[PDB]
Structures are given as structure tokens and as C-alpha cells.
Amino acid sequence: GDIFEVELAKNDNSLGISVTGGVNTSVRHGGIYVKAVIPQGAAESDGRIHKGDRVLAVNGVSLEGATHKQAVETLRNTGQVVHLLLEKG
């Protein structure tokens, strides 16, 4: 329920997380969700991103209504310091 923002500096083209979901998937009610955080992702976020967080936005792009491919493309096509708006699982 809590909304919070994280800032993650991409290395090796990676946020160090994996995501599931999309309006046309069976995951929850169509949102984008953090499925795993690998130690690189924990480091980039100073421990603040967690499995089960819903990803609401990437920088200026809202993920409302995104398909899985749209969310992945949005997450991939950015660099340097990435801003994520999240909702606690």
C-alpha cells in the first residue's frame, strides 16, 4: 500500500531485479511486480527494493495499463540513475 520512490544507478545494463505481470497476464490484477532482487539490485537500491513491490513508474513514464513487453521495454530503455515509483507488496 505504501508508495515510495527508489533511485538505482544501472550497471551492466541492469537494475538487478526481475519483473512479472502485465494487463494481459494472469499475475495478480495486471500490474508489474518485482519478482526477484539479486545482490546487484540490493546494492543499487541500498536495500530499498523488494520482491513483491509493484512498479508504478519508470522515470517520467507511468506503467499504468502496460503489457509485459511494454514494461520490460520501458525498464530496459533507460540508463544512468533510474527512478522507480513503487508500492509495497
Binding site: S14, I17, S18, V19, T20, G21, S26, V27, H68
Partner: peptide, 8 residues
């Protein structure tokens, strides 16, 4: 049932 996981 079935879902896709994508590392980013």
C-alpha cells in the same frame, strides 16, 4: 498457471 519472468 504460467507466467514470464524477465530480468532487467
Amino acid at each position: 498457471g504460467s507466467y514470464l519472468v524477465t530480468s532487467v
